[PDB]
Amino acid sequence: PLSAGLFKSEHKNPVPQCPPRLHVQFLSHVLWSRMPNQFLKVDVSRISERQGWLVQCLDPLQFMSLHIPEENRSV
């Protein structure tokens, strides 16, 4: 029945209130990314054969990703 009454815990409140989480966010550019200290280390063919363009990577690599659900974003 309301905007705020659909993405919160309760829904049977027909009163239009604004919780402190609802704050405007602008598409900004002041941000930093982190470069991993260990990449996938993939070699492609190193022979460049005539039977196709090869790529091969057997060494695995995993990392832990935090997930903000209210923003639906992984970091």
Partner: protein
């Protein structure tokens, strides 16, 4: 056998390309034609291949689509933004009238082109005959202008008029200032004696460019030909040939006499005491700055603009702070520069290939009497098409100019006593959504509270478009999802209704006037209702609900869509 799915109605704009994405434990093999790969099946009727899509006279190699995804040592070629590289029309000629005072000169130059195109054939020795063909070595255009009809005269004069039109439209006005044959002597004057000025050389060059451009625009209708490729990408040999063939005309004419990216160390490696030194190698010589920034610097502003960064540039040979002052000399392609900071004495120095930089005042150190603040982090900024390499120490065998200067003075590397390499925090390109800060200009948002509103407020002199968005989105899974935009008068607007389980976040893309009081209000009539209440000058602001979309530009169309089947 094919699949039952295609992504129709998608954004046709952009440079598409084949791409594979693999996690680990993978052995993939793409298959092109020719020497690149080996086709095992047949292509669809008419569909070409990537081995033909490759540019002529260019080696095709595979590379990481994202970035320099090379698990290597510190000798990684860190690069900033890139130019378009021209990865994706003739000049206007007939837009000017034909003056009559040079119409005879145009006749004589057209007949000059005619006699040149016939002597081109008498080089091979063609014969005069009534039939037209090439392999038979004969040409019916061996008669002179008195007997030849005007339609073929018009066809031969077409090329002459176009080439003279481009010559006159090139920016400079052009006014007034034996052999055994069957009876024809092609010999207007001497050609090898005279010499063509470089101005006319470049003029006829652009003339031939335009000629080949219009020829290609005519040939694209007649598939995937090197001649169909534009003249700027044509083969140099045919370029030279066409160039001299079309420059013989001007020889005859003159004969008779008519987004930067900022990289840095991790802010937790801030230093407040000691002598620290780090190297920066620059392969190119474009826009590059290097230095030490406090742990509050902006990744979007130029390095060294505000007090939050102590930088130095080689593109202008000056140190970068609040203001500018000439310092040191510039570098070349493939140089190195070592930056030193003594925090106990508060001195900053730069050595270009061992030579300590010097200003006009005669002080070896760049900056003096700067507070330690929160520390200093090694930082560089690379503009468009730049290639650099940082070295925070940890490799003295590769620290070339460190043993020459700094080691005897008492300067130690940045990461000499370090076991794991630095994180190398870079400036990201994706413009994520951030909360409006209090200490910001031209973006001020209040909060009032009957109904609750979140009004806006601004003050500046430069206008632009902002992309405001709410914090929490609305999801629907898995029921009916329909987004309807209804105006105050009626619901006569664009209505989108296609979402299986998406989290549509409310947003408004607004333009900034001098006074912008447009805001968002959560109201209620029968269901969830958000009213983006605007104010005066409401003609280019949009308000809708959007999933994750992060693109900074200025458009309302081509918003990257798709429809699966």
């Amino acid at each position: 056998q094919p699949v039952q799915g295609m992504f129709e109605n998608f954004n046709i704009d952009g440079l598409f390309f084949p791409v594979v994405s693999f996690s680990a434990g993978i052995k993939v093999r793409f298959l092109l034609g020719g020497r690149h790969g080996e086709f095992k099946f047949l292509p669809p009727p008419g569909y070409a291949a990537c081995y033909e899509a490759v540019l002529p006279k260019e080696k095709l190699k595979v590379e990481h689509s994202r970035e320099y995804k090379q698990e290597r040592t510190y000798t990684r070629d860190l690069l900033g933004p890139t130019v378009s590289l021209t990865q994706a029309v003739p000049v206007d000629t007939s837009q000017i009238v034909l003056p009559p005072h040079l119409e005879r000169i145009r006749e004589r130059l057209a007949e000059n082109i005619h006699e040149l195109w016939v002597m081109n054939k008498i080089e091979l020795g063609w014969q005069y005959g009534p039939v037209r063909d090439d392999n038979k070595r004969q040409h019916p255009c061996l008669v002179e202008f008195c007997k030849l009809p005007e339609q073929e005269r018009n066809y031969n004069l077409q090329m002459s008029l176009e080439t003279l039109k481009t010559l006159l439209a090139l920016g400079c006005h052009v006014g007034i200032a034996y052999q055994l044959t069957s009876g024809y002597k092609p010999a207007p004057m001497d050609l090898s004696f005279i010499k063509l000025t470089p101005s006319q050389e470049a003029m006829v060059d652009k003339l031939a460019e335009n000629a080949h451009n219009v020829w290609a625009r005519d040939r694209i209708r007649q598939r995937r030909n090197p001649r169909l490729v534009p003249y700027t990408l044509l083969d140099d040999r045919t370029k030279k040939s066409n160039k001299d063939s079309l420059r013989e005309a001007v020889r005859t004419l003159l004969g008779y006499g008519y987004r930067f990216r900022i990289f840095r160390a991790e802010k937790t490696y801030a230093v407040k005491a000691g002598r620290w030194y780090f190297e920066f190698e620059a392969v190119t010589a474009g826009d590059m700055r290097v230095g030490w920034s406090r742990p509050g610097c902006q990744p979007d502003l130029e390095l060294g603009s505000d007090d939050r960064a102590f930088a130095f540039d080689g593109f202008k040979a000056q140190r970068w702070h609040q203001g500018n002052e000439h310092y040191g000399r510039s570098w070349q392609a493939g140089d190195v520069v070592g930056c030193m900071v003594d925090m106990n004495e508060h001195t900053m120095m730069f050595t270009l290939n061992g030579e300590i930089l010097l200003d006009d005042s005669g002080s070896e150190l760049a900056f003096k009497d700067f507070d330690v603040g929160d520390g200093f982090i090694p930082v560089c900024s690379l503009g468009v098409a730049q290639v650099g390499r940082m070295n925070f120490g940890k490799d003295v065998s590769t620290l070339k100019y460190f043993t020459i200067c700094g080691l005897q003075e008492g300067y130690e590397p940045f990461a000499v006593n370090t076991n794991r390499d630095i994180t190398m925090w870079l400036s990201k390109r994706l413009p994520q959504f951030l909360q409006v800060p209090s200490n910001h200009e031209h973006i001020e948002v209040t909060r009032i509270d009957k109904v609750t509103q979140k009004s806006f407020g601004s003050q500046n002199n430069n206008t632009d478009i902002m992309f405001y968005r709410l914090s929490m989105p609305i999801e629907c899974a898995x029921x009916x999802x329909x987004x309807x935009x209804x105006x105050x008068x009626x619901x006569x607007x664009x209505x989108x209704x296609x979402x299986x389980x998406x989290x549509x976040x409310d947003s408004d893309f607004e333009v900034l006037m001098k006074t912008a009081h447009g805001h968002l209000v959560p109201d209620r009539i029968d269901k969830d209702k958000e009213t983006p209440k605007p104010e005066f000058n409401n003609h280019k602001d949009y308000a809708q609900e959007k999933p994750s979309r992060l693109k900074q530009x200025x458009x309302x169309x081509x918003x990257x869509x798709x429809x699966x089947x």
